[PDB]
Swiss-Prot record:
Tissue-specific expression: Expressed in a wide variety of tissues. Expressed at high levels in brain, kidney and liver, moderate levels in skeletal and cardiac muscle, and low levels in fibroblasts and lymphocytes. Also seen at high levels in spinal cord. Present in osteoclasts and mononuclear cells (at protein level).
Other remarks in the entry: The SMN gene is present in two highly homologous and functional copies (TelSMN/SMN1 and CenSMN/SMN2). The telomeric copy of SMN gene (TelSMN/SMN1) seems to be the SMA-determining gene while the centromeric copy seems unaffected.
Domain Tudor: 2-56
Protein function: The SMN complex catalyzes the assembly of small nuclear ribonucleoproteins (snRNPs), the building blocks of the spliceosome, and thereby plays an important role in the splicing of cellular pre-mRNAs. Most spliceosomal snRNPs contain a common set of Sm proteins SNRPB, SNRPD1, SNRPD2, SNRPD3, SNRPE, SNRPF and SNRPG that assemble in a heptameric protein ring on the Sm site of the small nuclear RNA to form the core snRNP (Sm core).
Organism of provenance: Homo sapiens
Disease: Spinal muscular atrophy 1: A form of spinal muscular atrophy, a group of neuromuscular disorder characterized by degeneration of the anterior horn cells of the spinal cord, leading to symmetrical muscle weakness and atrophy. Autosomal recessive forms are classified according to the age of onset, the maximum muscular activity achieved, and survivorship. The severity of the disease is mainly determined by the copy number of SMN2, a copy gene which predominantly produces exon 7-skipped transcripts and only low amount of full-length transcripts that encode for a protein identical to SMN1.
Notes on the domains: The Tudor domain mediates association with dimethylarginines, which are common in snRNP proteins.
Protein name: Survival motor neuron protein
Subcellular localization: Nucleus, Gem; Nucleus, Cajal body; Cytoplasm; Cytoplasmic granule
Full protein segment contained here: 90 to 145 of 294
Amino acid sequence: QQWKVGDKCSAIWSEDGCIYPATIASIDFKRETCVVVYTGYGNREEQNLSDLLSPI
């Protein structure tokens, strides 16, 4: 529990709608958000902490 910088999580892609490995690079408690990095894709997209999936 408790999301923090540098964590292996899982985020869904908005291109095909599937689960793919991710890594929380930054977080903004202000607007309760964060940024996930697509392991292997490099792309980084902003998502909601409450929408963060657990690792595999």
